[PDB]
Amino acid sequence: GSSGSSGLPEGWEMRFTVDGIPYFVDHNRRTTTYIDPRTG
Known part of the structure; x- marks a missing residue:
């Protein structure tokens, strides 16, 4: 469904x-x- 921006870094x-x-x-x-960047 509709998804937004969780919270990724710049870039x-x-x-x-x-x-x-x-x-x-x-x-x-x-x-x-x-x-994934956040998790890694």
């Missing part, structure tokens, strides 16, 4: 692939990773 973004997988996108680093 780290929250998005989901066509399938709907939990992944983050970095604007500064310009990279993609599956591992």
Whole structure:
């Protein structure tokens, strides 16, 4: 359902692939990773 911004750091973004997988996108680093930034 409707989702917002939990609380990610600067640069780290929250998005989901066509399938709907939990992944983050970095604007500064310009990279993609599956591992969560907060948790690690």
